[PDB]
Design an enzyme around this catalytic site. Structure first.
Site, PDB file in Angstrom:
ATOM      1  N   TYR A 508      32.367  36.293  39.302  1.00  0.00           N
ATOM      2  CA  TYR A 508      32.501  37.413  40.213  1.00  0.00           C
ATOM      3  C   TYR A 508      31.197  37.508  41.019  1.00  0.00           C
ATOM      4  CZ  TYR A 508      33.469  41.821  42.364  1.00  0.00           C
ATOM      5  OH  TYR A 508      33.626  42.822  43.287  1.00  0.00           O
ATOM      6  N   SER A 591      38.408  37.818  44.863  1.00  0.00           N
ATOM      7  CA  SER A 591      37.714  38.854  45.620  1.00  0.00           C
ATOM      8  C   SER A 591      36.263  38.461  45.927  1.00  0.00           C
ATOM      9  CB  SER A 591      37.779  40.165  44.842  1.00  0.00           C
ATOM     10  OG  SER A 591      37.349  41.214  45.661  1.00  0.00           O
ATOM     11  N   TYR A 592      35.273  39.252  45.520  1.00  0.00           N
ATOM     12  CA  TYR A 592      33.904  38.770  45.723  1.00  0.00           C
ATOM     13  C   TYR A 592      33.759  37.397  45.054  1.00  0.00           C
ATOM     14  CZ  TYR A 592      28.896  38.963  46.762  1.00  0.00           C
ATOM     15  OH  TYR A 592      27.629  38.697  47.253  1.00  0.00           O
ATOM     16  N   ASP A 669      47.520  42.212  51.949  1.00  0.00           N
ATOM     17  CA  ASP A 669      46.255  42.645  51.373  1.00  0.00           C
ATOM     18  C   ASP A 669      45.621  43.591  52.374  1.00  0.00           C
ATOM     19  OD1 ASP A 669      43.683  42.865  50.229  1.00  0.00           O
ATOM     20  OD2 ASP A 669      43.784  40.805  49.431  1.00  0.00           O
ATOM     21  N   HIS A 701      45.817  43.121  47.324  1.00  0.00           N
ATOM     22  CA  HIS A 701      44.634  42.508  46.721  1.00  0.00           C
ATOM     23  C   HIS A 701      44.804  42.145  45.257  1.00  0.00           C
ATOM     24  CE1 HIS A 701      40.638  41.090  47.189  1.00  0.00           C
ATOM     25  NE2 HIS A 701      40.166  41.803  46.183  1.00  0.00           N
TER      26      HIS A 701
HETATM   27  C1  KXB Z   1      40.849  41.968  41.542  1.00  0.00           C
HETATM   28  O1  KXB Z   1      39.668  42.568  42.037  1.00  0.00           O
HETATM   29  C2  KXB Z   1      38.500  42.094  41.366  1.00  0.00           C
HETATM   30  C3  KXB Z   1      37.776  43.363  40.759  1.00  0.00           C
HETATM   31  N1  KXB Z   1      37.457  44.388  41.763  1.00  0.00           N
HETATM   32  C4  KXB Z   1      36.964  44.075  43.099  1.00  0.00           C
HETATM   33  C5  KXB Z   1      36.580  45.429  43.617  1.00  0.00           C
HETATM   34  C6  KXB Z   1      36.944  46.425  42.694  1.00  0.00           C
HETATM   35  N2  KXB Z   1      36.746  47.749  42.848  1.00  0.00           N
HETATM   36  C7  KXB Z   1      36.137  48.105  44.036  1.00  0.00           C
HETATM   37  C8  KXB Z   1      35.937  49.579  44.174  1.00  0.00           C
HETATM   38  C9  KXB Z   1      35.729  47.184  45.010  1.00  0.00           C
HETATM   39  C10 KXB Z   1      35.048  47.665  46.278  1.00  0.00           C
HETATM   40  N3  KXB Z   1      35.894  47.406  47.404  1.00  0.00           N
HETATM   41  C11 KXB Z   1      35.958  45.802  44.795  1.00  0.00           C
HETATM   42  C12 KXB Z   1      35.592  44.768  45.762  1.00  0.00           C
HETATM   43  C13 KXB Z   1      34.281  44.337  45.835  1.00  0.00           C
HETATM   44  C14 KXB Z   1      33.941  43.354  46.743  1.00  0.00           C
HETATM   45  C15 KXB Z   1      34.928  42.811  47.553  1.00  0.00           C
HETATM   46 CL1  KXB Z   1      34.515  41.607  48.674  1.00  0.00          CL
HETATM   47  C16 KXB Z   1      36.233  43.203  47.510  1.00  0.00           C
HETATM   48  C17 KXB Z   1      36.556  44.186  46.603  1.00  0.00           C
HETATM   49 CL2  KXB Z   1      38.200  44.677  46.535  1.00  0.00          CL
HETATM   50  C18 KXB Z   1      37.574  45.777  41.510  1.00  0.00           C
HETATM   51  O2  KXB Z   1      38.060  46.285  40.505  1.00  0.00           O
END
Ligand code: KXB
Ligand SMILES: *[C@@H]1O[C@H](CO)[C@@H](O[C@@H]2O[C@H](CO)[C@@H](O)[C@H](O)[C@H]2NC(C)=O)[C@H](O)[C@H]1NC(C)=O
Ligand SMILES: *[C@@H]1O[C@H](CO)[C@@H](O[C@@H]2O[C@H](CO)[C@@H](O)[C@H](O)[C@H]2NC(C)=O)[C@H](O)[C@H]1NC(C)=O
Ligand code: KXB
Ligand code: NAG
Ligand code: NAG
Ligand code: NAG
Ligand code: NAG
Ligand code: NAG
Ligand code: NAG
Ligand code: NAG
Ligand code: NAG
Ligand code: NAG
Ligand code: NAG
Lengths: 727, 727
Positions: A508, A591-592, A669, A701
């Site tokens: 991540y 995601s990230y 998404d 997403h």
């Molecule tokens: C399946 O997702 C992986 C786990 N994530 C990712 C995630 C979560 N929560 C929040 C609040 C955020 C902030 N946007 C994020 C997030 C962080 C970075 C990017 Cl680039 C996209 C996303 Cl969505 C979460 O639970």
């Protein structure tokens, strides 16, 4: 013994039991067992059935959820639930009178209601319908309309817009009752000039023309929504005159430019605390606002403001921390990065400047959980100096050097990762252990911290797992440049350190992330290690959280640099280890983690054979303003445009020639837009790179619908197995 | 020794030479050589340079195409070309005076012009700009505005909307000059109530928010555009008053319901022919419209309408056929299905009943190519009873039994597929042979059908291909239910019938298609056969064309039935031949072929190991009205809704568990919408079937940009090579 198979994961064959309770007072809690709602007495453990699972058998609708009013006189029944974003949704609501045992059938809460909440005492109701706020003093009486400005996609009263829901409040709600129920505070958001993300939604086969979904969504650098804050006196509501909201203005130091409202906390019946954050998330102000009984207005003495600045990075882990007020509302406790860059508990007195740290050391406070006149209770990662462990502590407020660990020694082999839930006034607490052993839920009394009883020990799951070859987890650290960095490895059953296993790096790596920890998980990696004999490793490099600002802020204004580099170095070191086949190292993330995976695969490092990116960010200009600009500043020539342009996946297209890449994205998404992967594939095509791809029609997403979830993991499993020449 | 490789296909190593000429009179033509425009004298073969390649070096814009006026006095220069759909585009234009040798700088044609055309004689210009029609009498004088109602996406004057461009006129133009240049006739399309297909266009990386493209596009059964027809006298235009456009209304038999204008042909200086077609495409009416000098009106005697109907299918192969008028305009010839269901040339006299068939037999006329006082010239597949061959014939108008083949014996082994281009008044013709040998272009005089000279014989290509192991082509037939059905095979070099080869069935199979013919091609199949040793077969089954209505109409109101079954049965037939490995049979198709490929893979037949569908239709309600309803009627309970619902790919999803499937689609496909594949993938996911996929960002139906084209054939090659276990 059988192994933990893909079907076991996907069908949820081995289930973790929970013990989800809601404290209803200082000594009782609600617990739903076999669809019956029970009231438990914490001290003695006896219980009474409060509502039988039969009650609404003829209700006529599947009941999605319930909420009992604070005084137990009414229950809200939620049905026709339709999900929107991460937190938002619409539903229909009925109210059932517990005293008369009958549904109220007039002045019903309307259908398509967007948010409903009881007052904190009594049974007042506030709800949002068509973006406007309404209040019911009694469940059967007509409601009073508080706002008249609400307009779909434009003005939101009492609920958040897309980016506030997702990145600021982590909730659809923007409504805050006072401790009394007297006042209703609320925010109003104005998305008038925010641009819209548009994408197609295909729906059922029968829909002839695809629908276009349009959501106000500020990408990095674009126009953000504006916000106003209001407080209404709910006791003086007139059936004849529109209600009167009193606006509370942001401080002048915020009004000079773009800003956010980022925290609202009632301190007393007549004092509200508001935290504001500049758009450049460097600087925040906490305002203390007192009610003036004669004026009828709310005033925020400038001299009371508390300012929080960072020069190393942004403010807070993801945002400024929540203040925890003493009973009298005159002082509060708050987590703050100290002079050495470690997050600790700070004691603030209103009308006095600065603050006093009550904890210190090379570890961090994770959350402040309860506060009484005698003790403050908090979760931290101090124990055994493991950043990925979590334990409950209490600190004696009359002598800060007296700190006692409440959870460290309860079951030190099975339990190293705790969270907690205190009853009102902190008489009792439920402890929740998440690993490394099976989750264990226990109840305790604060007076002398005596164990009362075990609530759930997961003995059933334990019996089932006796028949399975489960993998094991190693949590340890490596040394990069004289600093410790933690990693974990899921190791196949019967791990033999003399053999050479394929390795999948699960990443991540977003700012303040932590993928190396002590929690027990049954997931895809469990299957990979148990059935396919693959080691699945995760590593926390620069930018990871809970280890101090030196590590977390290393990534400041430079996403896609050190955290990517560090994932590569971790893999190299794992390859040295004599049990890893260096010809078979894969990487994957969501995601990230999709972005990092893509950047790693595009690095030309030669370390990785293949990788999978799921719903990756590809260019920071495409992601939302609040998240992106927190780490990256603005994409202008005056600020950080140059690094925005140097940190795209597209610019590394050529290097993908050296790897097998699978790219996966949901077409609906709303969060990381399909756009982002669409631009990745086009860059790969433009440079003649072959790769594999999969879109998921109408998934968002999470790619979380039952069928899509099964399909994506089945697809990725084939891919990884092919890459590793596993039969 | 070398083969025809993937790179040779992709990079065009072996080029086919052409000879594109433009007749400018009864005895002279234009031909470009080194970007020099030469005029050639047909009788003697002498030439001279008309326009030096150096003439426009200082032009300052890259010239896209040119168009010389009929009287040789002016040349239009097209630049800033921007493609829209199959035929439409916009461009800038400059007119260069050839007598003065100067660019014209006065009263210029505007930028973003949508269509331009010289009068057929002289040097008048009609152009369309912002959906309105303008006329220039002289290239340096102001234009006269003809229409004022033009509006983007709503009212189109003199150009077609999406569906008329694609399915009706096969052109963007909807202007028709009278032979004299006196009148300009034009259609006007009204799309006010046509629904919009909407989809995302992602554009260059630098675009932060994707664009939504919206196109008026009637899907099957939806509201269609409406059409009107006008005629303007170009000789009486004034700088004071606006042009007076006379409307010609459709027959009353058309006005009772939805209809189309499907053909416009000027018969004389004062007689226009108009063909109209009912929305239910089994009824068409030809109107003969005459100019009245006295009133300035156009009159269409109800009495001299010609009516055409079909009981077994639709009218025409794709639309009612073109009338070819005798010089005096009192009679015409047109291809018509006869009593045996074979399409032959019919002679019509205006004001007389019925027509007279002047050709007959078990074979069809493909097109009428020229008409003189003595002879009518036509292309047919009579020769040797091969429906996939084409030859030029002439029939003596004074004795229909005297029919002479003009091309059959010119070179019987190299040339079996001809097209032709006659000079003005048909004194000379250029024959273009397309196979089975290398293309051969020759010039001939009509007087005694004497060969004048060879224009291009592709000797250069011939010499290169001698060094390559090229595949051979077999064209033959199998007998099913006592009917002959034709197929072709591209066979690998040094073909050995004692060996077993993998077979790829290359499918189109749309109504009136022909995939078995004598044409020479250098394509992906050439590479597969020459390099990978794969046999590539195509089969023309029920629904196929050029073999009479019994075969073509078998598919009426029943798309996705017989044409699919027959591809399967052909595959079975091919296996029973001893040189096919029945464990390695694949299938692929694009567009209609992608639909048929999917239906076949979903049939559960067990014949095919794997398959590729590119931009497939997945259910007929998603495709356009004009094409779909032609074969399928309307999707209503009273018409054909049951078969619309029974003929989707989605309903066969479960059966795809037996095969490997690759689904490919461009995201900006304005023709077969990405929606069609989006729904296929959703159905496979929903049912737990794994498959492979690839989207192409911003590519349309042709997936034809240089990089995408290379990418998709490379991707498909890997997929076939894996499925066939090929090194
Ligand atoms: C399946 O997702 C992986 C786990 N994530 C990712 C995630 C979560 N929560 C929040 C609040 C955020 C902030 N946007 C994020 C997030 C962080 C970075 C990017 Cl680039 C996209 C996303 Cl969505 C979460 O639970
Ligand atoms: C929401 O914000 C928009 C944009 O700032 C406000 O729109 C302006 O409203 C006032 C008077 O109506 C004027 O300044 C302009 O006419 C508007 N400008 C724009 C950009 O439209 C709008 O008033 C706000 N709405 C609420 C409820 O606060
Ligand atoms: C194109 O078609 C539209 C739609 O039918 C025409 O608009 C109609 O015109 C009549 C007369 O003006 C109105 O009474 C209707 O209400 C209109 N319908 C709609 C849906 O707007 C329009 O006039 C046509 N345009 C041209 C130039 O023919
Ligand atoms: C790469 O395209 C394959 C070859 N085709 C297909 C094609 C072509 N021309 C026209 C006018 C049409 C009618 N719309 C079509 C067509 C036919 C059926 C379907 Cl379902 C989709 C399409 Cl597009 C053409 O040249
Ligand atoms: C001379 C004359 O009548 N010109 C008219 C013009 O004034 C009008 O704007 C237009 C729209 O009807 O039609 C034309
Ligand atoms: C209702 O409750 C009883 C126990 O009181 C339980 O046995 C039964 O299964 C429940 N019915 C459900 C789960 O709907
Ligand atoms: C627990 O038992 C005590 C003693 O009878 C009783 O008074 C109390 O109401 C009980 N609590 C619950 C929740 O049943
Ligand atoms: C909500 O909708 C239901 C059915 O859709 C309908 O019966 C009812 O009238 C609605 N209730 C309210 C409170 O509007
Ligand atoms: C709650 O607090 C408000 C403000 O102090 C006060 O006016 C009101 O009376 C209180 N409500 C009750 C229940 O007394
Ligand atoms: C250590 O230092 C070297 C050189 O400055 C650098 O390349 C590397 O990224 C650093 N590693 C870490 C994790 O601090
Ligand atoms: C062909 O030659 C004749 C005789 O000289 C000449 O008159 C004519 O213009 C020539 N045609 C061309 C197009 O060069
Ligand atoms: C076409 O566009 C160009 C670029 O703006 C402009 O300079 C030129 O004058 C235009 N030509 C005409 C004929 O309007
Ligand atoms: C062309 O034909 C029309 C027929 O009405 C006639 O009016 C006109 O005079 C002719 N034009 C020329 C240039 O002879
Ligand atoms: C031949 O006839 C049978 C029906 O009796 C049918 O199964 C088959 O599809 C037919 N084949 C063709 C091409 O007519």
């Amino acid at each position: 013994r059988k192994t933990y198979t893909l079907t076991d994961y996907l069908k949820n064959t081995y289930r973790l039991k929970l013990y989800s309770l809601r404290w209803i007072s200082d000594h009782e809690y609600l617990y739903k067992q076999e669809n019956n709602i029970l009231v438990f007495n914490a001290e003695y453990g006896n219980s009474s059935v409060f509502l039988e699972n039969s009650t609404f058998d003829e209700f006529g609708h599947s009941i999605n959820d319930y909420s009992i009013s604070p005084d137990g006189q009414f229950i809200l029944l939620e049905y026709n639930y339709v999900k929107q974003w991460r937190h938002s949704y619409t539903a229909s609501y009925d109210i059932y009178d517990l005293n008369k045992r009958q549904l109220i059938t007039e002045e019903r809460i309307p259908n398509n209601t967007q948010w409903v909440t009881w007052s904190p005492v009594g049974h007042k109701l506030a709800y949002v319908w068509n973006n406007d706020i309404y209040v019911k003093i009694e469940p059967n009486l007509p409601s009073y309309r508080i706002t008249w400005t609400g307009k779909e996609d434009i003005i939101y009263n009492g609920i958040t817009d897309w980016v506030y829901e997702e990145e600021v409040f982590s909730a659809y709600s923007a409504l805050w009752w006072s401790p009394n129920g007297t006042f209703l505070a609320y925010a109003q958001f104005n998305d008038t000039e925010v641009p819209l993300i548009e994408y197609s939604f295909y729906s059922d086969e029968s829909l002839q023309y695809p629908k276009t979904v349009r959501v106000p969504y500020p990408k990095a650098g674009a126009v953000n929504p504006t916000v106003k804050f209001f407080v209404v006196n709910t006791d003086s509501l007139s059936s004849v005159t529109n209600a009167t909201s009193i606006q509370i203005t942001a401080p002048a130091s915020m009004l000079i430019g773009d800003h956010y409202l980022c925290d609202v906390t009632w301190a007393t019946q007549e004092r509200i605390s508001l935290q504001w954050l500049r758009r450049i998330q460097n600087y925040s102000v906490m305002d203390i606002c007192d009610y003036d009984e004669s004026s009828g207005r709310w005033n925020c003495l400038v001299a009371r403001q508390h300012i929080e600045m960072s020069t190393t990075g942004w403010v807070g882990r993801f945002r400024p921390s929540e203040p925890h007020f003493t009973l009298d509302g005159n002082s509060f406790y708050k987590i703050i990065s100290n002079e050495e860059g470690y997050r600790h508990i700070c004691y603030f007195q209103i009308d006095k400047k600065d603050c006093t740290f009550i904890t210190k050391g090379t570890w961090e406070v994770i959350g402040i959980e309860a506060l009484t006149s005698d003790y403050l209770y908090y979760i931290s990662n101090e124990y055994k100096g493991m950043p990925g462990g979590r334990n409950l502590y209490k600190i004696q407020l009359s002598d800060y050097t007296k700190v006692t660990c409440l959870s460290c020694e309860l079951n030190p082999e099975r339990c190293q990762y705790y969270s907690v839930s205190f009853s009102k006034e902190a008489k009792y607490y439920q402890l929740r252990c998440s690993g490394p052993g099976l989750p264990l839920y226990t109840l305790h009394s604060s007076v002398n911290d005596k164990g009362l009883r075990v609530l759930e020990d997961n003995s059933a799951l334990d019996k089932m797992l006796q028949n399975v070859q489960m993998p094991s987890k190693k949590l340890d650290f490596i040394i990069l440049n004289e600093t410790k960095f933690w990693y974990q490895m899921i190791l196949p059953p019967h791990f033999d350190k003399s053999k050479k296993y394929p390795l999948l790096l699960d990443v991540y790596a977003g700012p303040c992330s932590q993928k190396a920890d002590t929690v027990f998980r049954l997931n895809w990696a469990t299957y990979l290690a148990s059935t396919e004999n693959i080691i699945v490793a995760s590593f926390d490099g620069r930018g990871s959280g809970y280890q101090g600002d030196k590590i977390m802020h290393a990534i400041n204004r430079r996403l896609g640099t050190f955290e990517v580099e560090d994932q590569i170095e971790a893999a190299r070191q794992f390859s040295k280890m004599g049990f890893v086949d260096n010809k078979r190292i894969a990487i994957w993330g969501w995601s990230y983690g999709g972005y990092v995976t893509s950047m790693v695969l595009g690095s030309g490092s030669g370390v990785f054979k293949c990788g999978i990116a799921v719903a990756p960010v590809s260019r920071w200009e495409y992601y939302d303003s609040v998240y992106t600009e927190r780490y990256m500043g603005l994409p202008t020539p005056e600020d950080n445009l140059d690094h925005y342009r140097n940190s795209t996946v597209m610019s590394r297209a050529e290097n993908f020639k050296q790897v097998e890449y699978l790219l996966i994205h949901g077409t609906a998404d709303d969060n990381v837009h399909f756009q982002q992967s669409a631009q990745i594939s086009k860059a790969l095509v433009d440079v003649g790179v072959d790769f594999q791809a999969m879109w998921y029609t109408d998934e968002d997403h999470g790619i979380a619908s039952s069928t899509a979830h099964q399909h994506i993991y089945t697809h990725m499993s084939h891919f990884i197995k092919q890459c590793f020449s596993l039969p």
